Structures are given as C-alpha cells and as structure tokens.
Amino acid sequence: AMNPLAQSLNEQLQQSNATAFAMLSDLGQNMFYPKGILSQSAEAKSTTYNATIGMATNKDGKMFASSLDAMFNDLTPDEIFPYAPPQGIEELRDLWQQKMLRDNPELSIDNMSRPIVTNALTHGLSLVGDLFVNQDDTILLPEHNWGNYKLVFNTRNGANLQTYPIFDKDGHYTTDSLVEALQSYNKDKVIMILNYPNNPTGYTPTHKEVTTIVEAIKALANKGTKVIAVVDDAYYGLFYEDVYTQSLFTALTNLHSNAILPIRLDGATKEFFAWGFRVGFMTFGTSDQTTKEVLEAKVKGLIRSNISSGPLPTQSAVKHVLKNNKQFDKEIEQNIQTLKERYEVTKEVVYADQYHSHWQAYDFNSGYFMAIKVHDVDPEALRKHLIDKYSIGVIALNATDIRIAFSCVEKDDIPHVFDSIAKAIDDL
Amino acid sequence: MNPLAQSLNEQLQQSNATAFAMLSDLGQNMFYPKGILSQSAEAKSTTYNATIGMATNKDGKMFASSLDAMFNDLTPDEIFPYAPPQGIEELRDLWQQKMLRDNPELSIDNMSRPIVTNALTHGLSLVGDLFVNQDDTILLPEHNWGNYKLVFNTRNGANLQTYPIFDKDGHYTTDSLVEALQSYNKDKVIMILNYPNNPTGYTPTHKEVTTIVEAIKALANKGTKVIAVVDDAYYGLFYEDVYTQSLFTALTNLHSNAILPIRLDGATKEFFAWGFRVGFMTFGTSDQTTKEVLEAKVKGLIRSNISSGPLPTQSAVKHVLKNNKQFDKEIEQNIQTLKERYEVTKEVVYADQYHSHWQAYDFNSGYFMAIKVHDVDPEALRKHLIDKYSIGVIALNATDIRIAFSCVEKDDIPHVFDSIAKAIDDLR
Ligand SMILES: [Mg+2]
C-alpha cells in the first residue's frame, strides 16, 4: 500500500544514494509530498478569478480582523495571517542558509540541503525520528544529555539509547570513551546525537577534540556502519572560551563519506532569545542533488501530515531580523556578552579553593548551564533543602550531579547562589 | 514500557477500561515525564531559580528589542518565553468558556479542559498518535479533505473506509452512514465528522445530527469502540438554519463509555488566523481519571514532537478573547461578507439556465461548495477554465469540482459560474 509517489522518490534515492535510502525508517520509505491539489492550486494562480484558495480573501488580500493585525508592526498582513508553506517561508530558508554560511566559513553551499523550517529543534528531532529511526534502532549519545531525547527517541520512536561518558574522573572532558564506544559498536546503523554546547554541562569541545570525534565517526562509517549524525545546535554561538566555533555539522559534512549523514538542527530558540517563537531548521549534509530533493519531499510530507505548517508571524519576524539588521545584531551580542560575564563569575566562584571539599565542577565554557558533582551528599536531598531554606532552585540530574543555569542568575547574585549551595551541603 | 506509563494505564483501566482499549501502542507507552520537569515546577517559588532553560534578568526573560518591536499590546513575557506543552493555561480556560457559550447543551463536567495544539492538523496528528494503530479503520465521508489520508494512512498506517453523504440528486443523506454503521464488522473505528464540510460546505440539520448520533450509539452498543473525531475547522460559519452546536456536544451527551468524542477546533478559520497555528483538542468524558490520563499522554505526545506551540500567537488569541468587543465585531463583519457571497452563490448555482450544466451538492456553510458537472471530465474542465476563461477551480474526483466563495468577491460570483457553464458547453 505504498503510494506511487513514494515509490518514485525511493527509486530515485536508491539510484543516487543507496546508503541514504538504507537509513530510512519504514515511515521514511512510505512518505512523499502529495501533488494533485497543490499543483491544481498552483496552476490557479495564473487566473483572474482564483476560486481554489482555502482562505477568506478579497480584492486587496486576505480577510482578517484589523484588531489582530494591530498587534504587529513591520509585518504585512500577508506576513501574519496566511499559511506558511510546509517547508517554511522560502525567503527565511534563504536567509538562514546565509547566516549558516557566515557562521561556518568552511561550509560550502554545495555540500548541504537548503534548511527546512521546523517548529523549533524538538520538531527537528521528531522529524529525524520519523524519517530515520526504526523501532529498536540505537541512539548513541553522552550520558550527560537532555532528558527529552529519551521521550522523543525511546518513548515515541521505540529506539534504544546507548550512553557513553564525556567527562573523566576529574570532571574534565574526554573523547576517550566515545572512541571506545565507536570501536566496539556492533550494529549496521547508528543514530548519534552530538549536542555542543551541552545540556546540562555547558561544554563545547576544542577543534582538537572535534577532529578526534569526527575521525572516530569516519572510522566507524568505514567499518560498514551507516551513521546518522544529529548535530543538536540548540546553544550554538554561546561560546565563552577559545573553542571550535563552527557547527560540528561542518566538520562532519567535510568528511565526504556517503555512510555518514550529518543533520543539523538549529534555530531561533536560544540563538535569538526567542524560545516561544518555535522557529528552527533542519539541514542535511550531502553534495547530492537527488538526495537533497528526495529528503526535502519526504520532510515536507512529514510536516504536512503532523502540523501542516509552522507559525507564519514568528517565521516572518525571524526573516526580518536576518536581513543584515545591525541593531538586532548588537542586541544579540549584548545579550550573549551578559551570559559570558555570568559564565566568568561562575568560573571564579565554582573553582575557589574553599569549595574543593564541596563539589567537583564538570568543565564548562559555553551555553546556559554548568554542572557540579556534589561530594558526600545526595543531590536530591540537597535540592529540596535549597528550595526550603535558601530559596534557591537547582536541578538534580542524577545520583551525583547538580545543574545550575547561570542563564537565569544575575551576575551579582552568582557568588551567593554557590556559597548557599556549599552551606546547604555542609548542613547535610 | 516506562513505569509512569504503566501507572497511567492501570489507573485508566480501572476507571475507563474502554478508553484504555482505544489506545494505540504509542498511546499505551506515552506518559508525561516527572524527573527534571517536576524539579523545575517545585522551584517556581524560589528567589533564585537556576533551573529554567531560558535567559533571564531582573526584568524578566532576556530578549532582542528589535524582535519585541514587532509586537504591540503584548508584554515580552507573553512573546519570548516557552508556552507550556499543554498551552497557556489562561488560553485553555478562555477557549473552554467560548466553547460553553457556543454550546449551551454542553456541560463543563462532561469534557476535559481543551489542550492547545499547533492548529487542527496537529490535533488530527495527536488522534493518530494516541488512538490509531496500523490497520485500524478511519470511517469518513467520500467527500473529504485529502490530508486525512496523509495523516492517517500514510503516517499512521490506517485504512480509510468511505461512505456517501449525498444522494443521486446532490441532496445530503444520512442513509449511507447508517448502512455503513450497521454493516461495520470491526471492534474499533475512528470516525471523522467534518461539518461544515470540506469540500461541500454542508452542515446538517438538528434532525440529521440526531440520526447520525443515534446510529453511532447503536454501533457502540453492538461492541465497537468509537473514537468520534469532530473536525470543527469551519465551525460558526453557518448561513442557514442548521445545527449550530458542535457535533461534539451531541456525541458527548450520549453518555456512552464506548464512544470517545474528540473535538478539534481553533483560531485557524474561526478567527481568520490560518498562520497562527493555534487550535485545541477536547475529550468528551465525565470521568476525572480519563481526563487526567489523556491530558498526561497528550502532553507527552506534544513534548516529544514539537515541545510546545507558538507563544506569541497563543497570547494574541488570548488577548482577543479577553479584549473582545472590537475583535468580535470585525469577525462578525467578515462572516457576514462570507454569508452574502454564499447567498449570491445559492441564487446563481440553482438558476434554471444552468440545470443542464451541473447538479449542486447541498451547501449552507463554510468556504466551499461543490457541483457534479454534467457530461464532462472535471480535470479537462479545470484545465480549460484556466486556459480560456481565466477561472481557477479544483477538480475533486471523477465528477465534481469545488468552488471557494471564500476567495471570490460577491459581484464576481455570477461571472465565475457563467464561465463554468460556458466551459462545460465547450467540452460536450
Ligand atoms: Mg521512527
């Protein structure tokens, strides 16, 4: 019961990129983007009297309530009320690609698809699940990770999560355990999640470390394992030290292996301080035109059959600020500088000699968060005590670790927060 | 299966075994995580909340003034932060209030609190996730929206079974639905009820709704579990004396545990806000446990798919629900415009001069009407209308075309149908 259109797409992808086809889930194979009506509706645009549009319109555009239109500035009614395409507003796709190219000097436009707009990064992850993750596939990811990966990939998609450490005994970042995991990996397919800056540790690797990671992934690919390399760039750009500042997507795409499919998920969510906008992007690392076209068709079908399309007003808002808007650039830079100064205070406080008996920080240099391994006490007992007595909210990640978001603590408040954590530990 | 899902399932089984029996495999496995989310809500009343995955300062969330400048009347905390996965709680309340106002025979005790979705398609997708197994059957009219197939067949692997809703003479009939329900031979069905209809613009009378819901009750009592999806995309766009409550109300008032009504409605068409992506999902049940378990599972489904929906458009819909006087008048005017176009369409479609050209399917609502064209192929007609007459219409099937008066000014409608008649004569 596969649609002829899906079969057509599959055959084209098989001829041009058999490994990419082999990576598709069952849903991935069955998906396509329907013609018929869209083509009919498209053909109607050349007519004086277009009676095909499923929206209320009149002589000068869409019908709308002026009272709703009044809640926006700088956007035309056509940038607010109509449907966005399932793939997102085409201009936005262009402008976001331009931004990526600016941020990633070593990335070539020929080596990627045009970014497709998603309902932010979670939707991107869900789309990866739809398109490439079968029940009982394996997700390979650090033991320090975002809890929603499990709900997306295990609970929704039926995959297994296999974890590997990314910090050693002394709380310092290490690639050794990833390399060991890749060397022992015994299946013909893996989906890897790479999230740097990291939630929950706020670590971004050095170029040295990135090289090691991507060379290790290439070695796995060459052993006969197909690698879907999901690059979760939620905190991209929030870099406070001399680290690798391109996306790992670029490093991975520049390997030029047909057995590795890099997928970049990025967006406005944290980069543009726009969490509720729900504007993100999905980009494939491939130089093959057919692959680009078939994957775009399938993603369009996946989006159409899930949410139809994303929010036009917030897509339009993001589109506008991408057009070399120097004021917006400065505002983002200011905001990131605030985070960097908070990071700097956090570094000075967390590594002070007086707290060496209280915790061991995991390396951090980016993002929103850092984590500490609390000594001789339960992180859960510590958390509730901090809420009850000190009026401080922290996250207990696991049996040993606490996460603190310096993203929501003012610079002047940070020493108090950490000193209160140390006192709270000493209490128990 | 996660322990939390097992917990929810056991509670549902004890309180509403049939509702549990309706769940898909995904539906059974879903839950809403505690862990890190629970820890965050416990710290909401802390002075220093360092658990939030956002950037904040003393004033509230951090943001770019250039983006904030694109909105009026909304505060930044109504624009930039995350919405909850279930939607802004105030919006849920206000929409429920609207539903109650629109549906006098609906009791607040007999429904869940509406959950916000990314408009109605997301609602349909969620029904698919939660209740549709591969090879389940969707029972729906043969006149239907093409995306139902992509959502339920292509994405979810269900079969569509159609039944006619118009007789020989283009007149609406419940006879074929009753016949279909009497012969239906499986233990589960997912029905889709879409009135006003796409593509025919028909809404049934009180009389007809009674027949429909009595027939569905009879099927339920034979031992078939009925998920009754009420697609209210065009709700409120009523131009004749028809049933003006949602069919959700009629179905909920049956009080059968073997029928689970699910209402999908939203701002999309009701508020002339297609690109906003604000819709709602409501369950027809009087059982508190059912309400809580289904909400938990839907939250998990949303969290693992899109995370959350767009805050700015949710906040906008909230605002026009609260500050409503002017907005309500503007919407009323737009609907009056649609009514007048309908009235012209009726006057013209049934004029004697066109008796040989087509047979209209009954219509009284929404955006569209359909005609059965005499003696000519709709596709050939559609192409010829574009080429010679500069008229754009949709060819639905082997005999019918759809005309959207939603996008044709009142004074141009007679010309459109004049040209359709002329084009038909050209081809026969
Ligand atoms: Mg999958």
Side-chain angles (χ1 to χ4, degrees), chain A residues 1-65 68-356 358-428, chain B:
Chain A
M2 185 182 297
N3 191 280
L5 294 168
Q7 209 144 268
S8 186
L9 290 173
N10 293 348
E11 297 268 325
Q12 289 179 304
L13 190 65
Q14 283 198 138
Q15 180 82 66
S16 206
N17 196 339
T19 305
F21 179 74
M23 293 169 175
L24 296 178
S25 66
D26 286 348
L27 176 57
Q29 291 191 3
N30 276 11
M31 267 288 156
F32 62 101
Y33 191 61
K35 305 185 167 300
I37 301 302
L38 186 85
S39 71
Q40 288 190 37
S41 304
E43 290 165 32
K45 297 274 188 173
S46 61
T47 68
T48 301
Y49 306 100
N50 190 343
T52 74
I53 315 179
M55 287 183 299
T57 78
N58 62 26
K59 62 171 72 60
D60 36 50
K62 283 53 167 200
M63 295 174 46
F64 56 92
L68 259 191
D69 182 55
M71 296 182 169
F72 307 93
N73 305 304
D74 292 332
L75 306 178
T76 59
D78 284 325
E79 289 172 305
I80 296 161
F81 298 98
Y83 289 113
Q87 73 277 14
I89 289 288
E90 286 294 331
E91 188 161 8
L92 176 55
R93 298 180 72 189
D94 285 354
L95 288 165
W96 192 261
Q97 192 179 72
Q98 289 162 66
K99 170 188 181 293
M100 284 200 193
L101 291 165
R102 180 181 60 180
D103 292 345
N104 295 267
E106 300 193 290
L107 184 57
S108 171
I109 192 170
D110 298 333
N111 294 325
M112 60 164 148
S113 60
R114 290 178 61 251
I116 293 159
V117 182
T118 67
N119 197 277
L121 283 77
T122 300
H123 191 209
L125 292 165
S126 185
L127 290 161
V128 172
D130 288 337
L131 193 53
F132 297 112
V133 183
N134 283 311
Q135 198 169 345
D136 203 38
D137 274 341
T138 297
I139 312 304
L140 189 59
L141 77 176
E143 66 190 1
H144 285 100
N145 69 60
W146 184 43
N148 206 37
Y149 292 141
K150 191 183 176 186
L151 200 71
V152 172
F153 295 112
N154 172 301
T155 313
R156 172 175 276 280
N157 283 278
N160 312 283
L161 272 61
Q162 177 184 332
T163 61
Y164 59 86
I166 54 168
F167 300 91
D168 65 24
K169 282 225 90 277
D170 305 308
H172 301 347
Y173 185 83
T174 182
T175 51
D176 291 345
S177 298
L178 172 61
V179 171
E180 182 177 22
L182 297 174
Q183 286 176 349
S184 61
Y185 192 77
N186 67 339
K187 297 177 72 181
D188 61 25
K189 179 180 178 183
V190 65
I191 299 89
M192 294 181 62
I193 300 177
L194 297 166
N195 171 230
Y196 299 108
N198 186 254
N199 177 355
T201 63
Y203 189 77
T204 297
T206 58
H207 200 335
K208 191 73 140 45
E209 287 168 342
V210 167
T211 301
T212 297
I213 291 165
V214 298
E215 296 257 12
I217 296 171
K218 178 152 208 179
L220 178 53
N222 291 337
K223 282 160 157 164
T225 296
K226 305 172 286 292
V227 177
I228 302 80
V230 180
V231 178
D232 182 339
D233 273 352
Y235 306 88
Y236 181 76
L238 300 174
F239 302 125
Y240 318 131
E241 300 288 351
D242 193 343
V243 297
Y244 190 69
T245 62
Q246 292 183 96
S247 176
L248 279 70
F249 175 81
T250 303
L252 289 159
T253 298
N254 287 336
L255 293 174
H256 298 292
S257 162
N258 87 326
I260 302 165
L261 179 62
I263 306 176
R264 194 188 188 189
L265 309 177
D266 61 352
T269 307
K270 287 146 185 146
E271 289 201 55
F272 287 4
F273 296 72
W275 306 273
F277 274 40
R278 317 313 300 159
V279 178
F281 303 88
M282 178 175 81
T283 305
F284 300 102
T286 181
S287 73
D288 182 60
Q289 189 60 33
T290 296
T291 302
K292 294 175 194 187
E293 293 177 346
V294 167
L295 293 185
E296 179 163 337
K298 290 182 177 279
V299 171
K300 287 162 76 182
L302 287 170
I303 291 169
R304 173 68 165 173
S305 69
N306 177 203
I307 58 163
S308 195
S309 58
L312 185 63
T314 53
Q315 284 184 40
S316 296
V318 174
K319 182 189 60 178
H320 272 249
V321 296
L322 289 164
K323 303 182 182 177
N324 203 357
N325 182 322
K326 303 310 204 77
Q327 180 183 310
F328 171 79
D329 293 345
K330 287 188 206 161
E331 289 156 7
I332 296 297
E333 287 164 1
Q334 282 174 335
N335 285 358
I336 298 181
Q337 179 58 30
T338 288
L339 293 174
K340 182 168 183 255
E341 292 175 26
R342 292 172 182 194
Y343 156 78
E344 285 162 4
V345 175
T346 302
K347 181 173 65 180
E348 284 305 299
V349 171
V350 301
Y351 293 103
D353 284 354
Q354 61 180 125
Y355 305 121
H356 199 106
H358 295 89
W359 59 68
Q360 178 178 287
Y362 295 93
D363 290 354
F364 64 106
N365 54 23
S366 56
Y368 274 15
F369 311 112
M370 57 83 62
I372 59 166
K373 188 186 193 185
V374 301
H375 293 315
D376 287 33
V377 293
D378 202 308
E380 188 57 21
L382 174 58
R383 187 188 62 79
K384 297 189 77 179
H385 189 50
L386 284 162
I387 290 175
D388 192 31
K389 184 151 167 45
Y390 299 84
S391 214
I392 289 167
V394 301
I395 295 301
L397 295 169
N398 50 52
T400 59
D401 302 342
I402 289 286
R403 191 189 69 180
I404 301 92
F406 53 84
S407 69
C408 46
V409 182
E410 289 190 315
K411 186 180 181 176
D412 288 358
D413 291 337
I414 288 174
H416 169 75
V417 169
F418 279 93
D419 198 56
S420 295
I421 293 167
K423 288 176 179 177
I425 286 163
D426 280 335
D427 291 348
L428 301 176
Chain B
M1 179 177 281
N2 190 282
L4 294 169
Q6 208 145 269
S7 185
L8 290 172
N9 292 347
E10 296 269 326
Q11 289 178 304
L12 191 61
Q13 283 197 139
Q14 181 85 61
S15 207
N16 193 344
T18 300
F20 179 73
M22 293 170 177
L23 297 177
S24 67
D25 287 350
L26 176 54
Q28 290 188 3
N29 274 278
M30 269 288 155
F31 62 101
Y32 191 61
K34 300 198 186 317
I36 237 74
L37 278 169
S38 292
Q39 287 184 35
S40 310
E42 287 176 16
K44 266 183 160 182
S45 70
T46 54
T47 305
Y48 307 102
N49 187 352
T51 71
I52 300 170
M54 291 180 280
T56 76
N57 58 32
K58 61 171 193 304
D59 295 323
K61 308 336 190 219
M62 288 170 43
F63 60 90
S65 299
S66 295
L67 281 177
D68 182 61
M70 292 176 205
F71 303 87
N72 305 308
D73 291 354
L74 297 186
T75 67
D77 290 330
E78 296 174 300
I79 298 165
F80 298 98
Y82 288 114
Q86 72 274 17
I88 290 289
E89 285 292 335
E90 189 157 9
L91 178 52
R92 299 180 72 186
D93 286 349
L94 288 166
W95 193 262
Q96 191 176 219
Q97 288 165 62
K98 169 189 180 295
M99 289 188 24
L100 291 163
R101 179 181 61 180
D102 293 344
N103 293 266
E105 299 192 297
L106 185 56
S107 172
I108 191 173
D109 299 336
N110 294 323
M111 59 164 147
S112 58
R113 288 178 63 250
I115 293 161
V116 180
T117 68
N118 197 276
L120 283 76
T121 298
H122 190 206
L124 292 164
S125 184
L126 290 163
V127 171
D129 288 336
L130 191 53
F131 298 112
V132 182
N133 282 314
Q134 197 169 346
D135 201 43
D136 276 345
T137 296
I138 311 305
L139 187 62
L140 77 174
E142 64 190 3
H143 284 101
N144 69 63
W145 185 42
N147 205 36
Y148 292 142
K149 191 183 177 186
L150 199 70
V151 173
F152 295 114
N153 172 305
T154 311
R155 169 174 278 281
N156 284 101
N159 311 286
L160 273 61
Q161 178 184 329
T162 58
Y163 58 86
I165 53 168
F166 300 91
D167 63 25
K168 281 226 90 274
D169 305 306
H171 296 131
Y172 184 84
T173 182
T174 50
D175 292 344
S176 302
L177 172 62
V178 170
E179 182 179 15
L181 297 174
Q182 287 178 345
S183 61
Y184 191 78
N185 68 339
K186 297 177 72 178
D187 62 32
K188 181 182 176 183
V189 65
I190 300 88
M191 293 181 65
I192 302 174
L193 296 166
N194 172 229
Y195 299 108
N197 185 255
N198 175 1
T200 64
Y202 189 77
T203 298
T205 59
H206 284 74
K207 192 71 139 43
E208 287 166 350
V209 166
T210 300
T211 298
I212 288 166
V213 297
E214 295 260 10
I216 292 172
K217 177 150 209 180
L219 176 55
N221 285 339
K222 282 161 159 162
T224 295
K225 306 173 285 291
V226 180
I227 300 83
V229 181
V230 180
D231 183 340
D232 271 355
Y234 307 88
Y235 181 76
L237 300 179
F238 302 126
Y239 318 133
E240 299 288 353
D241 194 344
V242 297
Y243 189 69
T244 60
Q245 290 184 101
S246 176
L247 278 68
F248 176 80
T249 304
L251 289 160
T252 299
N253 288 335
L254 292 175
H255 298 294
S256 170
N257 87 326
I259 303 163
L260 181 63
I262 307 176
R263 195 188 188 188
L264 309 177
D265 63 351
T268 305
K269 286 148 184 144
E270 290 200 51
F271 287 5
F272 295 70
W274 306 273
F276 274 38
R277 318 311 303 162
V278 177
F280 302 89
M281 178 178 78
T282 305
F283 300 101
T285 177
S286 70
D287 183 59
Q288 190 60 33
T289 297
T290 301
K291 294 176 195 182
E292 294 176 346
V293 169
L294 294 183
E295 180 161 336
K297 289 181 179 276
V298 168
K299 287 163 75 182
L301 286 169
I302 291 166
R303 172 66 165 174
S304 66
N305 176 205
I306 60 165
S307 201
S308 56
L311 188 66
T313 53
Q314 285 185 40
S315 297
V317 173
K318 184 196 77 175
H319 267 251
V320 292
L321 288 165
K322 296 166 67 65
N323 311 80
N324 64 290
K325 293 203 178 194
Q326 184 59 37
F327 175 75
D328 289 353
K329 195 179 177 303
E330 291 171 350
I331 295 298
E332 285 167 354
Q333 177 44 247
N334 292 349
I335 295 171
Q336 184 63 25
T337 291
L338 294 178
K339 191 173 182 193
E340 286 182 40
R341 294 172 181 186
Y342 157 80
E343 289 167 343
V344 167
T345 303
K346 185 138 285 188
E347 287 184 45
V348 173
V349 168
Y350 293 102
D352 188 78
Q353 58 188 294
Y354 306 129
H355 177 68
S356 77
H357 296 92
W358 59 69
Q359 187 177 259
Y361 291 96
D362 291 349
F363 67 106
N364 56 22
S365 54
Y367 280 9
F368 308 115
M369 59 85 60
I371 57 175
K372 187 181 199 194
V373 302
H374 290 312
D375 313 315
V376 312
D377 178 40
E379 180 53 19
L381 177 57
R382 186 191 71 79
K383 274 161 56 164
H384 184 60
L385 274 165
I386 293 174
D387 180 41
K388 183 53 186 169
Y389 293 91
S390 206
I391 301 296
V393 305
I394 287 306
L396 296 167
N397 57 45
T399 64
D400 307 338
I401 66 166
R402 189 190 74 180
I403 302 92
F405 53 84
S406 63
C407 59
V408 180
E409 297 209 313
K410 188 187 177 184
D411 216 42
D412 300 336
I413 288 164
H415 173 79
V416 171
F417 284 99
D418 183 270
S419 298
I420 294 180
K422 284 186 164 63
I424 291 160
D425 285 329
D426 292 342
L427 294 171
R428 68 185 175 179

CSV table of all heavy atoms in Angstrom, one decimal, chain A residues 25-28 126-135 137 152-153 156-158, ligand 1:
chain,number,residue,atom,x,y,z
A,25,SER,N,13.7,5.0,7.9
A,25,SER,CA,12.7,4.1,8.6
A,25,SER,C,11.6,3.7,7.6
A,25,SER,O,11.5,4.1,6.5
A,25,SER,CB,12.0,5.0,9.7
A,25,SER,OG,11.3,6.0,9.1
A,26,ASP,N,10.7,2.8,8.1
A,26,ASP,CA,9.5,2.4,7.4
A,26,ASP,C,8.7,3.6,7.0
A,26,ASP,O,8.3,3.7,5.8
A,26,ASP,CB,8.7,1.4,8.1
A,26,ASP,CG,9.3,0.0,8.2
A,26,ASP,OD1,10.3,-0.2,7.5
A,26,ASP,OD2,8.9,-0.8,8.9
A,27,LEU,N,8.4,4.5,7.9
A,27,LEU,CA,7.7,5.7,7.7
A,27,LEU,C,8.4,6.6,6.6
A,27,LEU,O,7.8,7.1,5.7
A,27,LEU,CB,7.4,6.5,9.0
A,27,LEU,CG,6.8,7.9,8.9
A,27,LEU,CD1,5.4,7.8,8.2
A,27,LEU,CD2,6.7,8.5,10.3
A,28,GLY,N,9.7,6.7,6.8
A,28,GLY,CA,10.6,7.4,5.9
A,28,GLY,C,10.4,6.9,4.5
A,28,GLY,O,10.3,7.7,3.5
A,126,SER,N,12.1,15.2,16.3
A,126,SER,CA,11.0,14.4,15.9
A,126,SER,C,11.0,14.0,14.5
A,126,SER,O,10.7,12.8,14.1
A,126,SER,CB,9.7,15.1,16.2
A,126,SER,OG,8.6,14.3,16.0
A,127,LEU,N,11.4,14.9,13.6
A,127,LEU,CA,11.5,14.6,12.2
A,127,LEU,C,12.6,13.6,11.9
A,127,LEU,O,12.4,12.7,11.0
A,127,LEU,CB,11.6,15.9,11.3
A,127,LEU,CG,10.3,16.7,11.3
A,127,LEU,CD1,10.5,18.2,11.0
A,127,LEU,CD2,9.3,16.1,10.4
A,128,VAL,N,13.7,13.8,12.5
A,128,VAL,CA,14.8,12.7,12.4
A,128,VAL,C,14.2,11.4,12.9
A,128,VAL,O,14.4,10.4,12.2
A,128,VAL,CB,16.0,13.1,13.3
A,128,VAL,CG1,17.0,11.9,13.4
A,128,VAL,CG2,16.7,14.4,12.8
A,129,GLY,N,13.5,11.3,14.0
A,129,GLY,CA,12.9,10.1,14.5
A,129,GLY,C,11.9,9.5,13.4
A,129,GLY,O,11.9,8.3,13.2
A,130,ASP,N,11.1,10.4,12.8
A,130,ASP,CA,10.2,9.9,11.8
A,130,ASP,C,10.9,9.3,10.6
A,130,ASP,O,10.5,8.2,10.1
A,130,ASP,CB,9.3,11.1,11.2
A,130,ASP,CG,8.3,11.6,12.2
A,130,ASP,OD1,7.9,11.0,13.1
A,130,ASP,OD2,7.9,12.8,12.0
A,131,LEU,N,11.9,10.0,10.1
A,131,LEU,CA,12.5,9.8,8.9
A,131,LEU,C,13.5,8.7,8.9
A,131,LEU,O,13.6,7.9,8.0
A,131,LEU,CB,13.1,11.1,8.3
A,131,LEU,CG,13.5,11.1,6.9
A,131,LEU,CD1,12.4,10.7,5.9
A,131,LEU,CD2,14.0,12.5,6.5
A,132,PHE,N,14.3,8.6,10.0
A,132,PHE,CA,15.4,7.7,10.1
A,132,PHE,C,15.5,6.7,11.2
A,132,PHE,O,16.4,5.9,11.3
A,132,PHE,CB,16.7,8.5,10.2
A,132,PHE,CG,16.9,9.4,9.0
A,132,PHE,CD1,16.8,10.8,9.1
A,132,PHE,CD2,17.3,8.8,7.8
A,132,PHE,CE1,17.1,11.6,8.0
A,132,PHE,CE2,17.5,9.6,6.7
A,132,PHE,CZ,17.4,11.0,6.8
A,133,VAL,N,14.6,6.8,12.2
A,133,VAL,CA,14.7,5.9,13.4
A,133,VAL,C,13.6,4.8,13.4
A,133,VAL,O,12.4,5.1,13.5
A,133,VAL,CB,14.6,6.7,14.7
A,133,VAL,CG1,14.8,5.8,15.9
A,133,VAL,CG2,15.7,7.8,14.7
A,134,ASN,N,14.0,3.6,13.2
A,134,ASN,CA,13.1,2.5,13.3
A,134,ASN,C,13.1,2.0,14.8
A,134,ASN,O,14.0,2.3,15.6
A,134,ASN,CB,13.6,1.3,12.5
A,134,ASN,CG,13.2,1.5,11.0
A,134,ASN,OD1,12.1,1.9,10.7
A,134,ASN,ND2,14.2,1.3,10.2
A,135,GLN,N,12.0,1.4,15.2
A,135,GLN,CA,11.9,0.7,16.4
A,135,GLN,C,13.1,-0.2,16.5
A,135,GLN,O,13.5,-0.8,15.6
A,135,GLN,CB,10.6,-0.2,16.5
A,135,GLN,CG,10.3,-0.6,17.9
A,135,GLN,CD,8.9,-1.3,18.0
A,135,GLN,OE1,8.1,-1.1,17.1
A,135,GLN,NE2,8.6,-1.9,19.1
A,137,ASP,N,16.2,0.6,16.7
A,137,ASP,CA,17.5,1.3,16.3
A,137,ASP,C,18.2,1.8,17.6
A,137,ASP,O,17.5,1.9,18.6
A,137,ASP,CB,17.3,2.5,15.3
A,137,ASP,CG,17.2,2.0,13.9
A,137,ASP,OD1,17.7,0.9,13.5
A,137,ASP,OD2,16.7,2.8,13.0
A,152,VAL,N,11.6,11.5,23.0
A,152,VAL,CA,11.4,11.5,21.6
A,152,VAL,C,11.8,10.2,20.9
A,152,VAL,O,11.1,9.6,20.1
A,152,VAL,CB,12.3,12.7,20.9
A,152,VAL,CG1,12.3,12.6,19.4
A,152,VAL,CG2,11.8,14.0,21.4
A,153,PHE,N,13.0,9.7,21.3
A,153,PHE,CA,13.5,8.5,20.5
A,153,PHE,C,13.2,7.2,21.1
A,153,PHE,O,12.9,6.3,20.3
A,153,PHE,CB,15.0,8.7,20.3
A,153,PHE,CG,15.4,9.8,19.5
A,153,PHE,CD1,16.1,10.9,20.0
A,153,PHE,CD2,15.1,9.8,18.1
A,153,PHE,CE1,16.4,12.0,19.2
A,153,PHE,CE2,15.4,10.9,17.3
A,153,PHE,CZ,16.1,12.0,17.9
A,156,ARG,N,8.6,7.7,21.9
A,156,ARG,CA,7.8,7.9,20.7
A,156,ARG,C,8.3,7.0,19.6
A,156,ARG,O,7.4,6.4,18.9
A,156,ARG,CB,7.8,9.4,20.3
A,156,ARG,CG,7.2,9.7,18.9
A,156,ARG,CD,7.2,11.1,18.7
A,156,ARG,NE,6.0,11.8,19.3
A,156,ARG,CZ,4.8,11.8,18.7
A,156,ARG,NH1,4.5,11.1,17.6
A,156,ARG,NH2,3.8,12.5,19.3
A,157,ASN,N,9.6,6.8,19.4
A,157,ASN,CA,10.1,6.1,18.2
A,157,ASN,C,10.5,4.6,18.5
A,157,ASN,O,10.8,3.9,17.5
A,157,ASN,CB,11.2,6.9,17.6
A,157,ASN,CG,10.7,8.0,16.7
A,157,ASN,OD1,10.3,7.9,15.6
A,157,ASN,ND2,10.6,9.2,17.3
A,158,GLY,N,10.6,4.2,19.7
A,158,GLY,CA,10.9,2.8,20.1
A,158,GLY,C,12.4,2.4,20.0
A,158,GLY,O,12.7,1.3,19.9
C,1,MG,MG,10.8,6.5,13.9
